[PDB]
Amino acid sequence: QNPNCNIMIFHPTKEEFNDFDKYIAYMESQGAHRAGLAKIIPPKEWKARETYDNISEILIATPLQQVASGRAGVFTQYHKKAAAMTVGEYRHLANSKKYQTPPHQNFEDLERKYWKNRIYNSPIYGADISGSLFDENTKQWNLGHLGTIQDLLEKECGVVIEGVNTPYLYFGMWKTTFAWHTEDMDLYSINYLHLGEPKTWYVVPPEHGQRLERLARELFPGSCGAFLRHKVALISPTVLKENGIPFNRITQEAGEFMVTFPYGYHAGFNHGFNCAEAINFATPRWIDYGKMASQCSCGEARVTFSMDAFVRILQPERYDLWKRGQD
Ligand code: NI
Ligand SMILES: [Zn+2]
């Protein structure tokens, strides 16, 4: 299935939108994971929340200034602190003359601009906010409550990691950026754009993630032995074509879901003011990637959690063998 590793787009029926797990698995029987990313479009009736009133007076306690440096499509990005603000103020700042989305004829134009001018006017990302905009009544694809095996982490261990097993909110503006990464422990991620302007994703198929690693070692020489876990690298598509790294690019509109799959390297940016919600999740398929996830050796990035419970409970036949691989 899916021989060209293309980003597949699904339009589940209402019935198919009932069991989250079961549809993930169906997307995989059609080969979605081979691209490392898929778009899902919710049924017409489905809604995340009745209305987005009073999201104005919500508090972004610690927004981040994203300072890039480098050029010719290759940058390290670093995060610096900036003042607290309401979303009202952020919306307003993100539409001001300094941060607003530049005039552009089409996508190719916008992209050219983002990658040419990255180091200027460092944008402020309202990122990593612990919360959710989903209605409790929303029972299909509600990111607070997916009901996947990732929940084994909290029931077995009492282990809660923010943005991993509880959701994060992302208030974006033009040029706000996510560096090249696979998710923590190479988990799946799912992201819902709640509102506003689009988000662009670039994605490398899992089959080739190593090529991407290999390349990042040349572009940032002197580098854990798993550099990309720092999530500091920006690399433009031109630079990927130049070096023969397969990738795809897709632009997410408001109202749409993206799911990244284990070991699917991805990065991208926002086109303007927007608000996104995301969480990680897991399936039985992920366990083996979990146990395999290459961790940062220098300390700069976290070994997020222990695979122990997952193997013990869900792979009981292989558990003894897995322990002997340890200490
Ligand atoms: Ni991600
Ligand atoms: Zn490291």
Curated annotation (Swiss-Prot):
Its EC number is 1.14.11.66. The modification PolyADP-ribosyl glutamic acid is found at residues 15-16. One of its GO terms (biological process) is cellular response to ionizing radiation. Its cofactor is Fe(2+). It is found in: Nucleus. It comes from the Eukaryota. It is an enzyme of class 1 (oxidoreductase). Ubiquitinated via 'Lys-63'-linked ubiquitin chains. Deubiquitinated by USP14 with the help of TRIM14 leading to stabilization. Keywords: ADP-ribosylation, Chromatin regulator, Dioxygenase, Iron, Metal-binding, Nucleus, Oxidoreductase, Transcription, Transcription regulation, Ubl conjugation, Zinc. Residues 135-298 form the JmjC domain. GO terms for cellular component: blood microparticle; chromatin; nucleoplasm; nucleus; pericentric heterochromatin; site of double-strand break. Histone demethylase that specifically demethylates 'Lys-9' of histone H3, thereby playing a central role in histone code. Does not demethylate histone H3 'Lys-4', H3 'Lys-27', H3 'Lys-36' nor H4 'Lys-20'. Demethylates both di- and trimethylated H3 'Lys-9' residue, while it has no activity on monomethylated residues. Demethylation of Lys residue generates formaldehyde and succinate. This is Lysine-specific demethylase 4D. It comes from Homo sapiens (Human).
